[model samples]
Target: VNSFSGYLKLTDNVYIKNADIVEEAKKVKPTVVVNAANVYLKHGGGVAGALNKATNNAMQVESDDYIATNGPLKVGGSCVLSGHNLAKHCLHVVGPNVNKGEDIQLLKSAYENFNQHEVLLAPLLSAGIFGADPIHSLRVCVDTVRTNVYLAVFDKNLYDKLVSSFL
Candidate 1:
């Protein structure tokens, strides 16, 4: 129960497991890793921050270039960028801030946006600084993503709760 290695199957293709997204990306080498990102697509903090630091700011540079070229990402949008020392690409997604309004639709749109990728590793979107309920975020992720997804969960307590729920 204390271990973080086990995975919970949400479907035949989707699974949830305890992970540091950066470490998992390095280990699993998925085609793309998802960043719960801001509209500017800047890798500032949380998962985005860790990935940016891991890539020695190259991720930030690419993000800045992307924003400059494509304009800011709207809620529920995704931006794909080249990765460094990790997956082949980084998939940046903007989840809605529940503090602003009802955001399930936007969150679902965010998760559903992964259809183009074959292998994706994503976190429980909107559940951290964005103020959305973790359980609801999990459900939306489980329901929307159709690819092979590894839902990287960072919090140990939340991992235990998710495992318990599966039981």
Candidate 2:
């Protein structure tokens, strides 16, 4: 699929979200999850919410540590918790409504907070609320990961456009 002038360049990065997020997580047995959220995992709506439920609220429980931080997790701040299922570590980086306050550079550094692993499953940063089209088209995860990345692609047309058009 390395055609279209290597637009997506999925050679090292893999696209495998046609399946459910939990299902894909099982196969990857990832070490960390670059989940989207703020000081609270209360969103429990999108990938952030799904991950919170998947682990039975372990993420929310861990987010407790940040409560005393004097403010919502700054866009530059991040958190990690014990993991369940295919994940051994859970990392939360504030976003979605993020651009409203924090600088985008601080947002960009969130991915760097998580430790290395064999595979790390991350959502499209700020896509749902902050904006994902640019990040998706530009491939930010590819530029940030320390290991193989399996980014969830919920939008089929986008997956096709980004990964298939090149095929």
Best by TM-score: 1
For 122-154, candidate 1 gives per-residue lDDT tens digits of 888888777887888887777787777778988
lDDT of 1: 0.81
lDDT tens digits, residue span 1-167, model 2: 21111123365654435345555566666667677776555545776777777767766666665464534676645766666664777676765354465456554466555434555666666666555453442355556655555566666666666565443
Q: Give the TM-score of each candidate.
A: 0.90, 0.70
Clashes of each: 0, 2
Work out candidate 2's RMSD over C-alphas. Answer: 5.5
**Clashing residue pairs, backbone N/CA/C < 3 A, model 1:** none
Indicate which candidate wins on lDDT: 1
**CA lDDT of every candidate:** 0.81, 0.59
